[PDB]
Amino acid sequence: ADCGLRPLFEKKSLEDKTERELLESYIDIVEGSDAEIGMSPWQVMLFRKSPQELLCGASLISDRWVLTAAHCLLYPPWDKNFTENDLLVRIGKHSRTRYERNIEKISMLEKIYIHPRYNWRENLDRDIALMKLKKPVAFSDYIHPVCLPDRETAASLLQAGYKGRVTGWGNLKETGQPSVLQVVNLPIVERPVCKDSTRIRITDNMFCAGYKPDEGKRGDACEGDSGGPFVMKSPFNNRWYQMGIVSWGEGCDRDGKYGFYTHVFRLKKWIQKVIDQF
Amino acid sequence: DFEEIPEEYL
Ligand SMILES: Nc1ncc([C@H]2CC[C@H](NC(=O)[C@@H]3C=CCn4c(=O)n(CCS(=O)(=O)c5ccccc5)c(=O)n43)CC2)[nH]1
Ligand code: NA
Ligand code: NA
């Protein structure tokens, strides 16, 4: 309703330091920079209760639902299979490790919903899951949901060359951990190029992003960034939309390799369905 | 690596 309008930027008519770069591509984390306070109000941290550790990123889509990658909760080849009592969701964070008193809100999960057809056996196809919070979180200056794309938003923004933004507390190199939430703006890549960069079978529930080894700009999601949001700002209504979920990639920021994202619009029907089915 | 969180969260 109020989705994708950040209290500290859109609302007060302030621009973050790199959004122009997004907007300028619509034809007007490794190697990221620190995010500004309240730059990604929908960024959520998937936290492990015991031991206490960051599991993945995630995003707030309403006051009671968090969107993340299914491989964040379930990956049988690595004996990964989290229950709602296994995790904690931390919202409104900036600092990676410190408990941001009076700023962040920590929530408990009521229910985890994995895509019934999430393909963990082969290529992480349909890598998405919903988590419904035990109680609605209260919005604030640092906590605010992102918008989910509609068919025509997906249509006009999801184009090769158009940049999106990925955020996370993930590794700083394939082989570093930030103290503060990192950002990187990356271009969407043509699907043939995506396909030609890997042996894994790319489905329509996916898109890849990153620069060309030739383009001379770098950046990528990395370990711990999983389940985080790939977002775009609509130049039509000025809102931030989540187009993708950090899914998989081979290494972090390797030349001729790209990050792969769950195609949120393709799976929006399943999202709606479970949201007003429960 | 993490600062402890309010016990009531666990
Ligand atoms: N460049 C880039 N951007 C973001 C990243 C990712 C870097 C690491 C994370 N991703 C993972 O841990 C996922 C999840 C489950 C299994 N898994 C694999 O075996 N591979 C790697 C082996 S694989 O690619 O051959 C493969 C793909 C899909 C399923 C199984 C294996 C892979 O990428 N994944 C987070 C984003 N990389
Ligand atoms: Na290929
Ligand atoms: Na790359």
Side-chain angles (χ1 to χ4, degrees), chain A, chain B residues 1-3 5-10:
Chain A
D2 219 328
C3 76
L5 296 174
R6 297 166 303 169
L8 268 26
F9 301 85
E10 285 75 24
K11 253 46 160 301
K12 26 222 271 208
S13 187
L14 293 173
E15 282 199 2
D16 69 47
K17 46 164 246 112
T18 59
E19 46 189 289
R20 198 86 223 93
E21 193 196 356
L22 275 32
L23 284 287
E24 285 183 356
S25 85
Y26 306 148
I27 33 108
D28 228 318
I29 305 316
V30 188
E31 289 291 307
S33 68
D34 298 329
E36 301 184 58
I37 299 277
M39 196 198 209
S40 250
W42 36 84
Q43 173 75 221
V44 173
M45 176 179 293
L46 249 37
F47 202 66
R48 208 179 164 178
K49 278 148 103 139
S50 211
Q52 280 190 189
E53 46 171 0
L54 163 105
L55 283 200
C56 268
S59 61
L60 214 229
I61 57 181
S62 84
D63 70 337
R64 213 127 174 324
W65 295 92
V66 172
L67 189 57
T68 188
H71 81 257
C72 275
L73 310 179
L74 181 64
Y75 197 61
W78 290 351
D79 302 292
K80 196 146 148 207
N81 183 179
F82 295 111
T83 305
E84 22 276 87
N85 330 283
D86 279 3
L87 320 171
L88 251 34
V89 146
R90 306 182 58 179
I91 303 165
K93 292 199 52 60
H94 188 50
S95 162
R96 203 189 91 246
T97 57
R98 299 144 205 139
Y99 170 70
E100 294 167 287
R101 229 165 96 226
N102 294 189
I103 295 171
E104 74 173 279
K105 296 90 177 176
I106 302 191
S107 292
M108 289 190 299
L109 311 189
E110 177 161 83
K111 227 317 168 193
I112 291 192
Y113 297 89
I114 311 275
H115 195 293
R117 300 242 276 150
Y118 154 52
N119 197 346
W120 52 266
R121 295 179 158 288
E122 184 189 347
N123 54 358
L124 286 206
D125 175 23
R126 296 197 200 73
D127 188 17
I128 187 164
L130 289 162
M131 326 182 69
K132 97 151 307 157
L133 299 188
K134 215 147 179 236
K135 269 90 210 157
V137 69
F139 299 161
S140 76
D141 270 9
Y142 315 100
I143 298 189
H144 200 84
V146 73
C147 301
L148 287 187
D150 52 69
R151 189 172 131 158
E152 20 296 335
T153 296
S156 12
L157 288 183
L158 254 209
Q159 295 183 30
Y162 284 26
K163 286 160 192 219
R165 178 178 279 166
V166 190
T167 31
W169 288 284
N171 283 11
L172 285 177
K173 48 221 198 121
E174 200 172 319
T175 302
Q177 291 170 343
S179 52
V180 135
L181 182 80
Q182 314 290 105
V183 239
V184 69
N185 301 331
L186 298 166
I188 295 310
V189 182
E190 318 81 88
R191 238 135 133 25
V193 177
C194 288
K195 265 129 155 161
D196 273 359
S197 80
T198 185
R199 291 191 207 223
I200 286 200
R201 210 195 89 232
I202 301 323
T203 79
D204 288 335
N205 305 324
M206 301 168 191
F207 70 85
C208 85
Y211 300 91
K212 265 34 163 297
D214 98 84
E215 267 165 356
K217 273 254 309 134
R218 312 191 62 84
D220 203 2
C222 200
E223 227 237 293
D225 295 322
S226 266
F230 170 104
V231 295
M232 292 175 95
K233 181 194 266 217
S234 149
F236 306 106
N237 67 183
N238 257 51
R239 308 173 87 115
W240 289 94
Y241 284 97
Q242 182 169 178
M243 311 294 179
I245 313 172
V246 180
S247 192
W248 64 261
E250 299 153 61
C252 304
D253 206 29
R254 329 236 248 199
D255 283 343
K257 303 276 179 261
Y258 301 90
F260 283 83
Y261 292 86
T262 317
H263 197 309
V264 171
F265 184 67
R266 292 217 96 226
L267 305 160
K268 194 168 129 183
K269 287 9 103 177
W270 170 78
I271 284 167
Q272 252 135 212
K273 169 248 160 137
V274 352
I275 260 144
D276 12 64
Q277 210 202 144
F278 307 113
Chain B
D1 198 353
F2 292 71
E3 163 173 3
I5 65 150
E7 187 239 356
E8 21 303 319
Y9 288 116
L10 319 150

